[PDB]
């Protein structure tokens, strides 16, 4: 049998044959360094 | 150091021919979080 098969993904298909497409997202985290960080917030400057 | 590659340098003009008599210290310039093994480098010559 051929490993690979076709999806053959139709719009009149049901939603559990619907497309979706699937992103998994690792946040690998070597044990050095760090280059992935968040875009926190940063508030105004008060003086005085 | 600690998986970070830091790079100072400076610019001095020569009072004289060679190693001129004073002091001028190395500003930062860059660091880098390559975290690379290194032992051992070579530089590269211009040839016209
Ligand atoms: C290379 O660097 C890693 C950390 O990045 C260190 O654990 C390892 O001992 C180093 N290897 C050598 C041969 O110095």
């Not at chain 1, 946040?27 to 926190?40: D, R, S």
């Not at chain 2, 210290?25 to 070579?42: H, K, S, W």
Request: with cysteine.
């Amino acid at each position: 049998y051929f490993p690979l098969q076709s999806y053959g993904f139709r719009p009149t298909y049901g939603v559990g044959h619907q497309p979706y497409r699937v992103v998994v997202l690792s946040f690998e985290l070597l044990h050095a360094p760090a280059t992935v960080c968040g875009p926190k917030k940063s508030t105004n400057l008060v003086k005085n | 150091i600690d998986g970070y590659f830091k790079i100072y340098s400076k610019h001095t003009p020569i009072i004289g021919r060679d190693f001129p008599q004073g002091f001028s210290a190395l500003e930062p310039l860059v660091d880098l979080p390559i975290g690379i093994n290194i032992t051992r480098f070579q530089t590269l010559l211009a040839l016209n």
